[PDB]
Design a protein around this ligand. Structure first.
Ligand SMILES: *[C@@H]1O[C@H](CO)[C@@H](O[C@@H]2O[C@H](CO)[C@@H](O)[C@H](O)[C@H]2NC(C)=O)[C@H](O)[C@H]1NC(C)=O
Ligand SMILES: *[C@@H]1O[C@H](CO)[C@@H](O)[C@H](O)[C@H]1NC(C)=O
Ligand SMILES: *[C@@H]1O[C@H](CO)[C@@H](O)[C@H](O)[C@H]1NC(C)=O
Ligand SMILES: [Ca+2]
Ligand SMILES: [Ca+2]
Ligand SMILES: [Ca+2]
Ligand SMILES: [Ca+2]
Ligand SMILES: [Ca+2]
Lengths: 90, 445, 171, 407, 162
């Protein structure tokens, strides 16, 4: 019993106050096995085909910072991301 | 001493809000009140104190009734709850920043974008002085203008002094060597990107040369209501600064300022109801990232947020950055004008050039370093020979290459310490005997 | 008519004029130099230099009268947000085949780009005597005002360096 | 030496012959017959213009104007925007009751209070009630109507309330005039007998604007937030510690606001661009539309565009800016069923006979620039009785005693 | 939308309560107001980027259109609630364009003077309608002008030719 979770889009670039986009897995699971890191409005692109610089690991979750996206495109904003987590149940 | 009563009015005079009961739309009930006189202490914490014991307040401190204070242009004493203020003499400053941002003597900031010589300030009597200034296009379009030449017509308008935008001060079409001290005015150059001009009439000039050319003019308050130009008339009101020299107040800045052309063959200019950060998409992200440092508090600009309120410098910083063709010279000029107008109110920004505009900090020579408080009277030992002739107090400190707290400047090159400085006649070395042995600064004569 | 670039730095204006400009920085491809109000602007950005033989395009910047479209090899961005294609807003169609990425605007503009090197633009006959990009003006005259302005004949290498865009961080 | 009739007072520092000089119109003109320029228009000699109460004359290339003292106007409009009697613009978003004007300034005869409540979620506040204290009479402007509170026994300072266009206009016999568009915009006018004798958030009306930030304890401060926090009425009201930014707290409402409010800088208002500066009215409209985020934002918009078009009429430029898609107005609601008398007059300028002014009763200012729906009464009853919105015969209108209409 | 925008619910449910009120009480027995109340609240909680008084006035005119179609003409617009501007179209102060709140007027156009008639009845559609005078009582539609019966136009290949 190691079913995947749902998609969690609980933050936005044009809202919030964390100056970017951060998606964490609290309220669902404690220590995951795997994490999937995709975008909302075009979900087949990898993280290397967006060109933005993020970190998305099983330890803390997802982090995008708007200050890191300076000089990359002409807009300088995070895209809208969403995540799954994989957790095993007895 | 809040005594309890029945049937008394809830509208109490409270030692800051006096005379409440004249606007009292309530009936009376019971509760704890004041006696017949003896208004309630609001500012402190006591009860129904007498009226002539009301402690004043001024952004915090609980001033006792009688403690004076020295404010901006006035001094005030705490009377019974209210301040009694009395005026002190204080000057006024017209500024011409960017290519086109005029700030008059009475506030009133406006944008013009001209192409002519313009009368910036002139004395009204028949002669006294006249300060001109060229505001011509420097970039590609007509909306990319720059200051290029400052012309001063002083000493009954028979002496013309010209400040070109490469140094090159020239009197009556002839180059001069700086310093140049005369009977009626004097021109200094303390930091090679800064020229300081003082006049005996009451006019002081500061010409900035890098990154872009800018101008700062200072008048005494004796000349109040006695000047005309693009700097207004300096009378306290800013509604009549757009009043032309033929009657009536104009509406827009470019309609007022076409009446002060110094040449008749100049065309008339008009306003521009656009913003440059929409016409250029590549410049508007660079403008947002770097001019936002005036508003965030992690930087060394949040120290000035208690005094200067950067919300109007931020709007001009985005304006000039998106508009001009060399975007970093307009960024660093607009960041050095917030730091300039913050040192005018005490708070000096030591070291704001470490992440943003430090392309000239480390380029100082071998002995002298980059300073933020360079002034005229930190000069060589030749200035110590006069020591009361040319010091010219009343200006503002500027930032350039200079020597530390000791080791004054020699005749050329590095700055040696005080013992073997010079003996200034020609500046002799530290081995000459007249009977005056050459010594540290002073001479044994 | 049609402006077009392709291949190993080959260009072709609205009035013929096939030349070869190996510039690599950031350029103006076509723009509305009417003066009163600019309807569109197309900015081309050549890559870092792929190899000797091909010549790719890194990104295309396009601004039509209110909004900015940013095209890269993998994604299309409208006003800072990633769009799923096709996109059907009532003045602007943005659709992506397996080969080309098309942008269809009501202002009389049509862009079409395979995602490596070939870029072509189509304007209607409204914009005559107004275009000012590296695609020349749109007067109909073969090589008249593009290369011979005041009697001096401009080479295609100095015609292209005139069309450059200054970015405020990179030399 | 080439003079130009515009560079007379410049000085000629750095074509027409000697004698004659250019006029900016055409050929060379003598110095006596030189024209005049005012707001990008060119007026020949002996021309007459008015400036708000006065009359000027182009004499010899200069203006010769009469010296009378006009009424002074304070403004309160939108999400916390002010203009003082001496013409100083500032922003203050306070949530309490504030002194707008009074003459109980350090004993007094009036007081005007504004009640500012939060309108939105961003922390900006707008004005929703006006209390007028005249002697012992208390009016109150609240819920699109005027209410009389505490009419005194035999003093009863003579005031008058009538409705002119879309606004409600209170006038007093002592010189105090309040004009209210029934939502958020207020105009206070004082007769020139109140020079230097008032205080509040509207300044002190002494034709000198570097002392309008005098606090309640008679101290001139430089902060908008130390001045405005000192005119609150209750001591337990909080202090405003920063001004909000609505288009930064609502990033999704910025694109609509800056596109709708760009009518002001467009070719529709291009006759007024040389007579009124549109730039502080563009910035107010965008500040107002990013912050009406709880409901009804097309009312916050249409008020900000009618604050600019009102100044344009007042300066001599009538602009017709409303369409059936942009801020429509419904003036044939008031018609008797299909007899068409109520027309939308976009700039007010019509002087018809009411049943006050047929009996000599006239006002002390000119309110003929106020936008709204105006009657055009027929020729069998050409007298407009105002308190019922009916055209009546000159005999059968009413009584008008103690500010009440009696048929 | 009213759960993702909790701050817009109080305005939406107060403006949209005109439908269940005494203004529309002639139509309450002929058209069910309940799916039109729920559409109006769903529409006003979600126009959160700009222009929400257009999302409102359309939802109240979807209900009042059914009321006319079933036999109940209701006059619900005021100068404060959803105003309409029909004297915009008048020749400067000759007053012919009136707001007809329930459409029911059959005047002569320059199509129907030449036999051309439609196949449905569109005489329930809200809007501004002409009331052409008695020296040119024929309304030519493609220019919004009242014309004499001779000088109107051609109408070939769905194009007006003067
Ligand atoms: C316009 O101003 C005049 C001047 O003050 C007002 O006339 C005063 O009216 C009151 C009673 O109505 C008298 O007690 C004063 O003596 C009058 N003043 C003078 C100088 O005679 C007049 O009432 C104002 N107009 C209106 C409509 O109120
Ligand atoms: C400038 O400030 C520094 C403080 O670091 C100090 O050397 C001195 O106060 C000033 N230097 C002068 C006046 O030469
Ligand atoms: C300019 O005019 C029209 C379009 O405006 C164009 O067809 C014509 O060829 C052009 N002529 C010149 C001389 O540029
Ligand atoms: Ca966020
Ligand atoms: Ca997200
Ligand atoms: Ca002045
Ligand atoms: Ca050509
Ligand atoms: Ca004042």
């Amino acid at each position: 019993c190691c079913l995947w979770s749902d998609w969690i889009n609980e933050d936005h670039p044009s809202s919030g106050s964390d100056d970017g986009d951060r998606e964490t897995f609290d309220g669902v699971c404690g220590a995951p096995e795997d994490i999937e890191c995709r975008s909302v409005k075009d979900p087949h692109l990898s993280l290397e085909q967006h060109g933005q610089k993020v970190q998305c690991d099983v330890s803390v979750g997802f982090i995008c910072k708007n200050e890191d996206q300076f000089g990359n495109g002409p807009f300088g904003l995070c895209y809208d991301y969403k995540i799954r987590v994989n957790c095993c149940w007895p | 001493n809040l005594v309890y009563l029945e049937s008394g009015s809830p509208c109490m005079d409270t030692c800051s809000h006096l005379e409440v009961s004249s606007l009292c739309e309530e009936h009376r009930m019971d509760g704890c009140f004041c006696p017949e006189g003896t208004v309630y202490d609001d500012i402190g914490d006591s009860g129904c104190v007498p009226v002539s014991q009301c402690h004043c307040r001024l952004h915090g401190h609980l001033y006792t009734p009688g403690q004076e204070i020295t404010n901006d242009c006035e001094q005030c004493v705490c009377n019974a709850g209210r301040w009694v203020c009395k005026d002190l003499p204080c000057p006024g400053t017209c500024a011409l920043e960017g290519g086109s941002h005029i700030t008059t003597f009475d506030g009133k900031t406006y944008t013009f974008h001209g192409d002519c010589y313009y009368v910036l300030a002139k004395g009204d009597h028949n002669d006294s002085y006249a300060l001109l200034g060229e505001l011509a296009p420097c970039g590609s379009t007509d909306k990319q203008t720059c200051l290029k030449t400052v012309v001063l017509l002083a000493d009954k308008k028979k002496n013309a002094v010209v400040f070109k935008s490469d140094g090159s001060v020239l009197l009556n079409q002839l180059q001069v060597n700086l310093p140049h001290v005369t009977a009626s005015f004097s021109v200094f150059r303390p930091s090679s990107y800064h020229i300081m001009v003082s006049m005996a009439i009451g006019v002081r000039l500061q010409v900035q040369l890098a990154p872009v050319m800018q101008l700062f003019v200072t008048l005494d308050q004796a000349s109040q209501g006695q000047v005309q130009g693009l700097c207004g008339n300096f009378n306290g009101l800013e509604g009549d600064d757009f009043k032309t020299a033929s009657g009536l107040v104009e509406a827009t800045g470019a309609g007022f300022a076409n009446t002060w052309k110094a040449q008749s063959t100049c065309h008339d200019k008009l306003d521009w109801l656009d913003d440059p950060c929409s016409l250029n998409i590549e410049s508007a992200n660079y403008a947002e990232h770097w001019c936002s440092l005036l508003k965030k508090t992690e930087t060394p600009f949040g120290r000035c947020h208690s005094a200067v309120d950067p919300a109007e410098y931020y709007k001009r910083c985005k304006y000039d950055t998106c508009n001009c063709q060399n975007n970093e010279d307009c960024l660093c000029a607009a960041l050095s004008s917030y730091a300039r107008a913050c040192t005018a109110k005490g708070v000096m920004l030591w070291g704001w050039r470490e992440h943003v505009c430090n392309k000239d900090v480390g380029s100082c020579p071998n002995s002298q370093v980059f300073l933020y408080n360079l002034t005229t009277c930190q000069q060589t030992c030749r200035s110590l020979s006069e020591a009361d002739s040319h010091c010219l107090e009343g200006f503002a400190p500027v930032d350039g290459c200079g020597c530390p707290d000791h080791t004054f400047l020699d005749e050329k090159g590095r700055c040696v310490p005080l013992a073997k400085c010079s003996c200034y006649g020609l500046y002799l070395e530290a081995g000459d005997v007249v009977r005056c042995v050459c010594r540290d600064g002073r001479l044994h004569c | 008519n049609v402006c077009s670039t392709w291949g190993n730095f080959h260009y072709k204006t609205f009035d013929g004029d096939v030349f070869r400009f190996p510039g690599l920085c950031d350029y103006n491809f076509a723009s509305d130099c009417r003066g009163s109000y600019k309807e569109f602007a197309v900015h081309l950005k050549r890559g870092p230099g792929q190899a000797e033989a091909p010549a790719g395009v890194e990104s295309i910047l396009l601004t039509i009268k209110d909004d900015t479209i940013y095209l890269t090899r993998h994604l299309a961005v409208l006003n800072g947000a990633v769009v799923s294609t096709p996109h059907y807003s009532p003045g602007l169609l943005i659709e992506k085949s397996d080969a080309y990425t098309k942008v269809y605007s009501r202002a009389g503009l049509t862009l079409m780009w395979n995602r490596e090197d070939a870029l072509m633009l189509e304007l209607d006959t409204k914009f005559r005597n107004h275009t000012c990009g590296l695609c020349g003006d749109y007067n109909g005259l073969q090589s008249y005002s593009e290369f011979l302005s005041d009697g001096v004949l401009f080479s295609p290498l100095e015609f292209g360096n005139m069309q450059k865009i200054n970015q405020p961080d990179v030399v | 030496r080439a003079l130009s009739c515009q560079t007379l007072a410049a000085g000629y520092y750095h074509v027409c012959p000697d004698g004659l000089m250019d006029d900016g119109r055409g050929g060379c003109v003598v110095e006596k017959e030189c024209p005049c320029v005012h707001n990008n228009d060119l007026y020949s000699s002996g021309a007459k213009i008015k400036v708000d109460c006065n009359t000027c004359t182009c004499k010899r290339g200069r203006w010769v104007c009469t010296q009378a003292v006009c009424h002074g106007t304070c403004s309160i409009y939108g999400s916390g925007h002010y203009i003082t009697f001496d013409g100083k613009y500032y922003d203050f978003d306070g949530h309490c009751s504030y002194v707008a004007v009074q003459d109980y300034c350090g004993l007094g005869s009036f007081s005007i209070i504004t009640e500012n409540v939060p309108c939105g979620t961003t922390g900006v506040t707008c004005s929703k009630a006006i209390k007028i204290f005249m002697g012992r009479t208390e009016l109150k402007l609240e819920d699109k109507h005027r209410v009389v509170i505490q009419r005194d026994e035999g003093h009863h300072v003579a005031y008058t309330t009538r409705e002119v266009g879309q606004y409600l206009v209170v006038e007093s016999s002592t010189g105090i005039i309040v004009i209210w568009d029934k939502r958020t915009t207020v105009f206070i006018k004082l007769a020139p007998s109140y020079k230097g004798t008032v205080c509040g958030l509207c300044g002190n009306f002494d034709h000198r604007s570097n002392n309008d930030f005098t606090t309640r304890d008679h101290m001139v401060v430089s902060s908008e937030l130390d001045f405005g926090n000192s005119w609150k009425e209750a001591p337990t009201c909080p202090d405003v510690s920063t001004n909000p930014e609505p288009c930064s707290l609502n990033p999704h409402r910025r694109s609509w606001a800056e596109k709708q409010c760009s009518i002001l800088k467009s070719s529709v208002f291009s006759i007024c661009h040389s007579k009124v500066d549109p730039k502080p009215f563009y910035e107010a409209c965008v500040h107002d539309s990013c912050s009406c985020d709880t409901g009804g934002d097309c009312e916050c918009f249409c008020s900000a565009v009618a604050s600019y078009a009102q100044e344009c009429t007042k300066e001599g430029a009538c602009v017709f800016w409303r369409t059936p898609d942009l801020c429509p107005i419904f003036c044939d609601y008031y018609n008797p069923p299909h007899e068409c008398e109520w027309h939308y007059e976009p700039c007010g300028n019509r002087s018809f006979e009411t049943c006050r002014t047929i009996n000599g009763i006239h006002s002390n200012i000119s309110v003929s620039y106020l936008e709204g729906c105006y009657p055009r009464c027929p020729k069998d009853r050409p007298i407009y009785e105002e308190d019922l919105k009916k055209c009546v015969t000159a005999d059968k209108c009413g009584c008008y005693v103690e500010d009440t209409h009696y048929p």
